[PDB]
Amino acid sequence: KDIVKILTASTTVTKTGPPPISAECPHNMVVLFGFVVKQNFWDHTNKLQSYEMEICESGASSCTSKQTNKYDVSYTYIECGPQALPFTEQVVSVSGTTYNSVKCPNDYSVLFGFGMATSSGHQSALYSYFTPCRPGLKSCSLNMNEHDDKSYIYLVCVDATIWTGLNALSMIAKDDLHSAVGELVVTCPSEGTILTGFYGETHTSSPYTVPFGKCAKSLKACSVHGSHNYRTLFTVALCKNN
């Protein structure tokens, strides 16, 4: 079964906002995969206090977010297609030391995958950057710089003996740190076109005014648009090599 074929007729869905955010899915469509990112801001300095990251369950008409923990905004992304996928499992590993690395369960292979890094506390709150994981490999390494807090590697693992040609895919992730005082574009290698991805902005002070979205499919780049404690623009996507 060609995962390209079904990732083009799948339907990305993104949602940003404070509590409550559960991004939902179209008629009889189901969450193949996805993830949720929560930001938590001190009740006084209003600076950042922490990141959190969770998985959307397989076969659900909603990203069930799953809180009694305060959290002040959540960026949510789900790929939502017709059916749940067989032999496919999602993963988050988090770390604090230099390395952060993840193996795939039942010896699977990365289909989708990326690391985010942060540095919520020194005093440079959004050190938050982004890295790609390679389709095909069983791992995903990611060394973090120092005075980083935590690294969040999230990957969708497929059983590489039924999902074919993962070696034909590639993950792109560009980011750029905008100041606190003008655009961001990233394009596929090997003249590739997008399968699925997301584009957004994050802050270390957030007033609640919204900014987040999804990449367009069978196209060749992904684009954002800028809307101390400064804030970052990012783009993650996955490409097939044509």
Author numbering: 559 to 625, 628 to 681, 683 to 742, 751 to 777, 779 to 797, 804 to 818
Question: Any passages from the paper?
Answer:
PPLPs are found across apicomplexan species, and contain a conserved central membrane attack complex/perforin (MACPF) domain, as well as a unique C-terminal domain, named the Apicomplexan PLP C-terminal β-pleated sheet (APCβ) domain, and a variable N-terminal domain. The MACPF superfamily represents an ancient homologous group of pore forming proteins, which function principally in cellular attack or defense. PPLP1 is implicated in cell traversal by sporozoites across the mammalian dermis and into the liver to invade hepatocytes and replicate within a parasitophorous vacuole (PV), as well as in the evasion of host phagocytic immune cells. PPLP1 also plays a role in erythrocyte egress by the merozoite stage (gametocyte) of the *Plasmodium* life cycle, via membrane disruption.
The structure of PvPLP1 APCβ domain was determined by X-ray crystallography at 3.15 Å resolution, to reveal as expected three β-stranded repeat motifs arranged in a prism ([Fig fig1]; see [Table tbl1] for data collection and refinement statistics). Each repeat consists of an inner four-stranded β-sheet and an outer two-stranded β-sheet, locked together by two disulfide bonds. Comparison with TgPLP1 APCβ domain (root mean standard deviation, RMSD = 0.978Å between 170 atom pairs) reflects a conserved C-terminal domain architecture across the *Toxoplasma* and *Plasmodium* APCβ domains. Flexible loops between the inner and outer beta-sheets in the third repeat, which are absent in the crystal structure, were subsequently modelled in for molecular dynamics (MD) studies (see [Sec s4] below). Three 100 ns atomistic MD simulations of the PvPLP1 APCβ domain structure indicated that the overall structural core was stable, at an average RMSD of 2.5 Å, while the modelled loops were more flexible. Comparison of loops of APCβ in PvPLP1and TgPLP1 reveals that PvPLP1 lacks an extended loop and any aromatic residues at that point in the structure, containing instead several polar and aliphatic hydrophobic residues, as well as a histidine residue at its end rather than a tryptophan. Sets of 20 simulations for each protein were performed. Only two binding events were observed in PvPLP1 simulations ([Fig fig3] and Fig S6).
